[PDB]
C-alpha cells in the first residue's frame, strides 16, 4: 500500500531514499538561507481508513 | 626493390535474414551419435535480421596465442660460497617446471616451432653484518651444453672456454640477453606427450623424459669472487615463433605434481551450486 | 515426411511424428487489404513481438477424462505483447497456428480429437438461463466437459456427447480438425485464418473460436507403463493487426 | 633493398609497414602473426558421409 | 555428485511432473561452474572478451519406446529467471519432440548492446539464463524403465570470437618443479 | 513563416508563433542500420503506437521560480505503448521531438531557456555522497532547481546557476536549445537524434538526456494581467526500436 | 548578484534616464571577469595569443509593447572610457531599434597593430571598451511593466584564432584523488 | 617506393571590402530565440578594407 | 621503402619531411597533427530552415 | 594513447646512510579486469606470462609504450547519467561504465640494506 504523495517544500527539499510504500520514511531539508520550522522526517503509518504520513510538511522560513 | 605482401583479414560470418517457416526441413533435430557437431546458426531457429559482422578471430590463432614470452625456470647462484657447486646454476632444458606455459603448450600433442629465448638476471647483495664495498659491474656467462658435451665442475673449469658450445656474456645493467633458436629436434615435432617406454622390454622410464633430450644450461659469474657474498637469480623466458601444432587435447583439469610425470590427484569436475534449477535472483529492489 | 519445424517470431517448434498440417479451409492468414477495410486510421503491426508461440499450461489425460476446451482469444490475453496490444487497442485481427502436443509410448493407446470451432456459442445448464463469462473461459486454464449432464446455474451444459453446443459430437469433423492417435502421431497442427463476418473485431467481447480436445478412445496401458500422460497446447498468432488505440481496458 | 611493405592491423567500421630481414637464418625472423586460416570441419564434422543440416541426421 | 559421472546427466521421469522445472542455469560460458570447465569455457578463460552465439545440443538418453516433448527457453537478461512455463514460454524457446533423431539444438543467439562481453561477467554484461520444462511429459509402455536421462553439449556457433588474452585462473603452483 | 504543424502518429501539433526548429546537430532520428548494429535478433518497430505526441503535466511559471528538469526516457515510461514496449524489452533506441508550449499576452514579459543535455550526470548536495534515483527523476513530475544552494542527503545540488552539473548555467547554449521570449515566440521545438556511445541501450538504467527549462529573465506583469502562466511539455519518440524481449521489468 | 541569475541580465527602465549609462565593460575576452568564464573565455584560457573579431548579440527581454532605441559603441584604445553619449557617438557604434526582430549584433572588429594579442592582456595589447547608452528611451503603454532586461551573448567571428597552448588557471587541486 | 601526401592548410577567412549602405538588408537584426548564432562579419556592420588573412586554426 | 614524403608546417607572408612506420599496429603510429577541418554550422546554426543573414530572422 | 612512466627513487632519510647499492630495476605490470592480482613483491603473478609488463633499469630513458582503443563501447564515455543495476540503483555515473584494470609496480632487485 502507498501513502499519498509527500508534496513539495518550497525553498526546501524532500528526500525519499526508499519509496513511499508502507513503513517508508522521508526526510525534510531547507535550502541555504532558510530555517526549517516543523518536523524533520515523516513515516508511512496507518491512518484510520488508509495509510498516510506521520508528520505534516514543514516550512522553510527566511533567515 | 620493394615487395608488396598481401594480408587477408578473416572476419566471422554475417547473420543472414530469416522469416517464418513451415516446412519439413528440421535444421535443429540431429543425432550426436555420429560424432558430428551441429551447425545451427541462429538464423535457423529464430527470425534474425541481417547483421554485417566485422569481428575477427585474429587474436585466437595459434601464433597469436602462443607467441608470448613466459618464464620456464628460475635459479640462483652465488659469487662466493663454501660449496663450489652453488657458485653456478645448471639445469636440463624443458618447458615443464612452470605450470602456466606447460598447461598452455599441452592443449596439443605435437608442437613444432622456433623459439626466442630471453634471460632476466638480477643480483642482490646478501644480507649480513658488514655490508659496504665497491664492487664493479658483474658480468655473467650462460653456456648451453648440448647432449654429450662435457659439463663444468666448478666456475674455474676448462669447459667455460666455450669453444663450440654457444654461450653469452652479459654485463649487468644492459638490456636482457636474447637469442633465437631453431627447431632443434630429431623427430618431426616436439611431442608433449608420449605413451611409451624407452626399453623394448616395455619397461624403463615412462613418457616424456624418454623422448626429449635437449641438454643443459650453466650460468656463472665471470668476474670472480666477491669481498662480501652476493647472490644472482636467473629467469629464462621462452617465446615460440613460427608455431605449428597438431592433435589438440582437452585442457588439463587436475593440478600438476612434478615435471617428470603426468601423475595427479583426482579432482572434482566442477564446483557446486545449490540445486540443478538454481539461478540467482538479481533484479530486486 | 513426419518431421516438421515451425518458426514463428523468436520461437520454433520441432516435431518428428506429425501427420500433416490442416490449413483451415485451404486459406492462410493474411493482412486486411485496402478494399476490404473499414477503419480509417493506421494499424499497428508488431509482427515479431506478437506472432510467436505462446504455450499454455498442460492438462493430464487420465483414463476417465471427458475433454477440454479453450477460447481464443481471451486465452492469450495475458501472454506477452499480444495480451497488451490487445488491451490498449479497440479493434484487433489475427489468425493463429495451434500445435497440440501429446506423446506416449508404444505400449499406450488412445485417440484425441483436436478441433477448432468458429463461433462456438454454448448452452447453459438450466435451459431457461444465461451463461457467465467464467463459464465460457478461464483464460489459460482449460474448462472440462463432463461424462454426464451437468447441473448448476450459469454453467455450460458440458456433457461431452453434445459438446456444449447442442449438436452431435461426432459431426465436429466438419470443422478444421485432426486426431492424435497414440499409435501414429503425437501432435496436431491447425492453421486458422481470421474467420468472422466483419473485417476487424474487438478482442475482449468476441471469442473468435474455440479449441476442443476430446478423447474418443480413452487411455489405457498395462503393468507399469507410465501413468502420467500430459497434453500441451501452443498457439501462435499470425498476421496480427490492431486499430483504434486508447487507454487500457480493465476487467 | 630487399624490403617488403605489408599492411597493418586496422579495425573496420599510411597503413603499410616495412620489413627487412637482417640475419642469415629463418629462425631469426619475426613471428607470422598475420596468417588467419581455419578448417573446423576437421574436428567439428569428421564423418565419412556428409550431413546437410536440413535433412534428418539419420533416415 | 561432483566426482561422479552423474554430474553429466539430467534426470527426467514419467508422471505428472509438469509443475517441476527440469533444469536451469545462467549463460556465463566463462564463469558459471556449469560452463567454466568445458572446452568452450576452458578456451574462453584464456581471453577477456567474448562475442558470438552458443549452441546447446540436448540428447535424450532413455528407452527406444519412451516419448516426450520438452520446452527449452532462453531469456535475455532484464528480469528474474522464469518460475513457471507460462513465463518461459515468452522467451526465445524451442519445443523438442523426442523421436528417431534423438538430439535437438537450442541456439542461444547473440542479443547484447556491447559488441563484446567480459568473460569475468558482471551484472552489466550479463547474458541471461536458460530453463527447461515439460511440454507434455514422458510416456512409457509396460516393461520399460521410468527414469531417463538427458545430456547437454555446448559449442560455439560460427560467429563466435574471443579477444584480449589473459592468464587462466585454473592452473597454479607453489614452487618450481611442478 | 511562424506557423507550423508537426504530425506524428495519430497526433498533431499546431503553432502560430514558432521561431524555428532546432535539429540537434543537423541530424535527424534514424533507424539502426545493418553495419552499425550489434544485436542478432529482429527488432520490434511499432511505428505509430509509440512515435506520437505524449503530453506531460504542466508547471506554473511563477514570478520567483528557478527552473525545472525532466529526464528522458523514464519520463515516458508510463505513457501508452512506449512505456510498455520499454518494459518488455531489454534494449531500446529512439530519438525524440520536444515541443515546449508557454503562451502569454503582449503585456507580459519573460525569457525561458529550453535546453536538451546529453548525459547530464548530476551532483549530490553533500559533496561526499550519492544521489538517489528519485532525486534525478520523478517521472512526469518535474524536479525543480533552487535559487540557493540546497542541502539534505541524496538530493541533487540544484542551485540554478550551476544547473546541477557543476558548470556555468549560461554556457548551456552549447547544447541544442531554444528560448521562449514572451515577446516573440510561445513554443520551442528540438528534434533530438539518438546520441549515445553504444548502438542500442537499456531504457531503465540510462537517462539518455535531460530537458532543462530555466527562466533567465523572470515573469512580470502589471495591474490585472493574468497571474497564471503555465508551461506544457510534449515529447514524441521517433524511429523507435526495441530488441531483446522477455518478461516485464518491475521497480 | 554573483550566484544569482540576476548576474546575467542588464536592467533597463522607462523615464528620462538619458544621462545614465546602461552598461560598459572592457574588451578582454580572456581576463575580464565579465568574459573569462564564457565559452569564448574558457576556450581562450587554454591558449596564450588570440586574434580575430568578436560578436556581441543583445536580446531585449521586455514586453511585446515596450519600445526603445539603444546606442552600442566600441572605442579602440587610446583614451579613457567615454563618459557621455556625445563621446560614445564618436566610436564604432550601432543604433539598435527594438522591434519584432528582438536581438541585434554589435560586431567588435579587429583593430590592432600586432597580428595577435595576449590572453593575459596588459596595457600594451589592450583592446578597448564597449559602452551602451539610451538613444531615445523606453516607452510603454498603460498596464505593462516599466523595468525590462537586456542580455548579451558573446561569440567569435569567422576569422578568430588562438595559439600557443598553455594551462588554464581555473582548475586546481591540493592532492591526488580529486 | 616513396609516396607524396597532400596536406592542405586551413587559413581563416579574409575581410572583404565594403562601402556605404542604404538598403532593407539588415544583417544585424536577428532573433536568438531560434537557437542560431548570428554570422555577422565586421564587413556587415562597418566599412572594412580588404585584408588577406593568413592566420591558421 | 614504404616511405611517404609530406609537407612541413611553414608560415606564409626543403619543406618536405619523410615518414616510415616500423610497427605492425596502427596504434603505434604518430599523431595526425596535420588534419585541419571544420564544420561549425553543426553547433552554430543547428536549425531546420536556413537563415540568410540579410533577411529578418522572422517574418 | 601513448603512456610514459617517470620513476624516481630517493634514499630515505635516516641515521646510518651510506651503502653501495647497484642500479634499481622496476617492473610495471598491467592487470586487465579479471586476472589475479599480486599479494606481495614475491608473488607468482609477477611471472607476467600473458599480462604485459615492463622492466626498466634506472638511469635510462623513461619507459613508454602505445595502447589501442581498449574499450567495449564505441567511445570512452566521460559522463554517464545512469546506474549499474536495472532497479535504478547501484553505483551512479562513470564508475559503472569504465573498467580497464589495474597497474602494479615493484622493485625487481630485492630488499635493501637501508
Ligand atoms: C646460450 C643459449 C642457450 C639457449 C638454450 C635454448 C635451448 C633450446 C631448446 C628448445 C626447447 C623447447 C622445448 O623443449 C619444447 N617446447 C618442448 O615442448
Ligand atoms: C605495462 C603497460 C601499462 C599501460 C596501461 C595502459 C592502460 C590503458 C587504458 C587507457 C585509458 C584511457 C582512459 O581510461 C580514458 N581516457 C577515459 O576517458
mmCIF file of C-alpha atoms in Angstrom, chain C residues 3 10-17 52-60 78-80 99-108 140 186-187 222-234, chain E residues 13-19 64-71 85-86 88-104 134-146:
data_model
loop_
_atom_site.group_PDB
_atom_site.id
_atom_site.type_symbol
_atom_site.label_atom_id
_atom_site.label_comp_id
_atom_site.label_asym_id
_atom_site.label_seq_id
_atom_site.Cartn_x
_atom_site.Cartn_y
_atom_site.Cartn_z
ATOM 1 C CA UNK C 3 9.498 -34.408 -39.383
ATOM 2 C CA UNK C 10 11.707 -15.935 -31.860
ATOM 3 C CA UNK C 11 10.102 -19.331 -31.315
ATOM 4 C CA UNK C 12 10.497 -22.704 -33.004
ATOM 5 C CA UNK C 13 8.608 -25.985 -32.828
ATOM 6 C CA UNK C 14 10.247 -29.277 -33.757
ATOM 7 C CA UNK C 15 8.253 -32.450 -34.306
ATOM 8 C CA UNK C 16 9.059 -35.942 -35.505
ATOM 9 C CA UNK C 17 5.711 -37.759 -35.673
ATOM 10 C CA UNK C 52 5.185 -16.139 -31.785
ATOM 11 C CA UNK C 53 4.484 -19.394 -29.956
ATOM 12 C CA UNK C 54 2.749 -18.899 -26.598
ATOM 13 C CA UNK C 55 2.459 -22.085 -24.541
ATOM 14 C CA UNK C 56 -0.489 -22.618 -22.199
ATOM 15 C CA UNK C 57 -0.301 -24.822 -19.137
ATOM 16 C CA UNK C 58 -0.786 -28.520 -19.727
ATOM 17 C CA UNK C 59 -3.554 -30.936 -18.777
ATOM 18 C CA UNK C 60 -3.325 -34.525 -17.603
ATOM 19 C CA UNK C 78 -2.160 -12.396 -20.505
ATOM 20 C CA UNK C 79 0.567 -13.576 -22.885
ATOM 21 C CA UNK C 80 3.270 -11.043 -23.553
ATOM 22 C CA UNK C 99 0.029 -27.005 -32.136
ATOM 23 C CA UNK C 100 -1.244 -29.641 -29.697
ATOM 24 C CA UNK C 101 1.451 -31.909 -28.280
ATOM 25 C CA UNK C 102 0.739 -35.204 -26.551
ATOM 26 C CA UNK C 103 3.258 -38.030 -26.558
ATOM 27 C CA UNK C 104 3.010 -41.581 -25.284
ATOM 28 C CA UNK C 105 4.963 -44.788 -25.728
ATOM 29 C CA UNK C 106 4.294 -47.770 -27.972
ATOM 30 C CA UNK C 107 2.539 -49.640 -25.164
ATOM 31 C CA UNK C 108 -0.116 -46.926 -24.670
ATOM 32 C CA UNK C 140 -5.306 -20.399 -19.969
ATOM 33 C CA UNK C 186 1.900 -37.161 -31.265
ATOM 34 C CA UNK C 187 0.939 -33.631 -32.350
ATOM 35 C CA UNK C 222 -0.555 -52.341 -18.746
ATOM 36 C CA UNK C 223 1.650 -53.497 -15.929
ATOM 37 C CA UNK C 224 3.856 -50.494 -15.238
ATOM 38 C CA UNK C 225 3.681 -48.194 -18.237
ATOM 39 C CA UNK C 226 3.847 -44.515 -17.389
ATOM 40 C CA UNK C 227 0.665 -43.401 -15.653
ATOM 41 C CA UNK C 228 1.081 -39.689 -16.400
ATOM 42 C CA UNK C 229 0.308 -38.526 -19.943
ATOM 43 C CA UNK C 230 0.056 -34.730 -20.327
ATOM 44 C CA UNK C 231 -1.257 -32.623 -23.204
ATOM 45 C CA UNK C 232 0.299 -29.267 -24.031
ATOM 46 C CA UNK C 233 -1.192 -26.598 -26.283
ATOM 47 C CA UNK C 234 0.805 -23.917 -28.088
ATOM 48 C CA UNK E 13 10.878 -39.170 -15.272
ATOM 49 C CA UNK E 14 7.350 -40.121 -16.205
ATOM 50 C CA UNK E 15 4.234 -38.961 -14.415
ATOM 51 C CA UNK E 16 2.547 -35.661 -13.703
ATOM 52 C CA UNK E 17 5.680 -33.589 -13.185
ATOM 53 C CA UNK E 18 4.637 -30.588 -15.223
ATOM 54 C CA UNK E 19 4.904 -28.282 -12.212
ATOM 55 C CA UNK E 64 13.630 -46.508 -27.635
ATOM 56 C CA UNK E 65 9.948 -46.552 -26.660
ATOM 57 C CA UNK E 66 9.730 -43.603 -24.254
ATOM 58 C CA UNK E 67 8.164 -40.492 -25.739
ATOM 59 C CA UNK E 68 8.069 -36.909 -24.546
ATOM 60 C CA UNK E 69 8.147 -33.285 -25.613
ATOM 61 C CA UNK E 70 10.268 -30.670 -23.875
ATOM 62 C CA UNK E 71 10.409 -26.872 -23.856
ATOM 63 C CA UNK E 85 6.319 -22.459 -18.029
ATOM 64 C CA UNK E 86 3.933 -19.626 -18.850
ATOM 65 C CA UNK E 88 9.479 -19.460 -20.073
ATOM 66 C CA UNK E 89 7.020 -19.717 -22.957
ATOM 67 C CA UNK E 90 7.553 -15.984 -23.552
ATOM 68 C CA UNK E 91 11.297 -16.234 -24.102
ATOM 69 C CA UNK E 92 13.305 -17.471 -27.078
ATOM 70 C CA UNK E 93 12.386 -21.110 -26.956
ATOM 71 C CA UNK E 94 12.182 -24.379 -28.853
ATOM 72 C CA UNK E 95 9.921 -27.384 -28.403
ATOM 73 C CA UNK E 96 11.875 -30.586 -28.825
ATOM 74 C CA UNK E 97 9.963 -33.711 -29.801
ATOM 75 C CA UNK E 98 11.746 -36.898 -28.781
ATOM 76 C CA UNK E 99 11.829 -39.393 -31.621
ATOM 77 C CA UNK E 100 14.204 -41.072 -34.029
ATOM 78 C CA UNK E 101 16.553 -38.095 -34.323
ATOM 79 C CA UNK E 102 17.481 -38.132 -30.658
ATOM 80 C CA UNK E 103 19.103 -34.734 -30.104
ATOM 81 C CA UNK E 104 17.927 -31.154 -30.554
ATOM 82 C CA UNK E 134 7.956 -30.469 -19.692
ATOM 83 C CA UNK E 135 5.611 -29.664 -22.532
ATOM 84 C CA UNK E 136 3.545 -32.850 -22.432
ATOM 85 C CA UNK E 137 5.530 -35.317 -20.312
ATOM 86 C CA UNK E 138 7.154 -38.722 -20.634
ATOM 87 C CA UNK E 139 5.059 -41.749 -21.588
ATOM 88 C CA UNK E 140 6.462 -45.295 -21.493
ATOM 89 C CA UNK E 141 4.822 -48.672 -22.122
ATOM 90 C CA UNK E 142 4.875 -51.547 -19.660
ATOM 91 C CA UNK E 143 8.249 -53.131 -19.050
ATOM 92 C CA UNK E 144 10.492 -50.137 -19.747
ATOM 93 C CA UNK E 145 12.188 -48.024 -17.068
ATOM 94 C CA UNK E 146 10.565 -44.795 -15.993
#
